[PDB]
């Protein structure tokens, strides 16, 4: 028929501000500007869960880290920004952590290792020799191409600790 068309608005979302610091405060708040950076910066720290914020010159560091590190190195980071004068530590450990570990009662282990040095030598064949261990005593059966290589088996063999007795059983070709 004939034109019609639509009526729309405009908006001017982004503007000009030419503007500057006439009066605001920005002195310790421009101190955590800087100590975000160090904490992203490290991926051995997760920012994601600490809030970083400077009062008196002073940055303090609390949320949540994974570990004791994870905090050691947070408030390094942040004590290594110009400006901060001191930074309190109320990071706090999330996950569970130990100290001292142990294994089981078993024989089994001394054969576990002295395997991991006769193969890890450059003359025992342990590819070819295999080695038991029994109340402590430590046996090695198979077959070496030389004495050169029996005697270093056997060496190991009683260097390793919790072994009582040596048993070369370990044939030469």
């Known amino acids: 028929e004939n034109n019609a068309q639509t009526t729309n608005e405009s908006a001017g979302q982004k503007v000009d ?5 006439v009066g605001n405060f920005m002195d310790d708040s421009a101190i955590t500007a800087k100590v975000k950076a160090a904490l992203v910066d490290h991926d051995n720290i997760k920012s994601t869960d600490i809030s970083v914020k400077t009062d008196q010159k002073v940055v303090t560091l609390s949320g949540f880290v994974e570990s004791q590190a994870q ?27 130990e100290g001292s570990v142990k294994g089981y009662a078993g024989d ?13 030598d450059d003359i025992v064949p342990s590819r070819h020799v295999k080695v038991e261990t029994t109340d402590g005593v430590v046996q090695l059966s198979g077959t ?17 600790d919790g072994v009582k007795s040596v048993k070369n059983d370990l044939k030469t070709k």
Do not use: P
């Not at 501000?17 to 610091?21: A, E, Q």
């Not at 282990?109 to 193969?119: G, R």
């Not at 029996?150 to 390793?160: F, L």
């Open 17 to 21: 501000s030419s503007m500057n610091k």
């Open 144 to 160: 070496v191409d030389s004495q050169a290589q029996s005697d270093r088996a056997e060496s190991i063999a009683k260097a390793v």
């Open 108 to 120: 089994t282990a001394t054969t576990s290792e002295i395997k991991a040095k006769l193969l890890a």
């Open 71 to 97: 905090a050691e190195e947070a408030v390094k980071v942040a004590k290594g920004v110009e400006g901060v004068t001191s930074v309190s530590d109320k990071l706090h450990v999330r996950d569970a952590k």
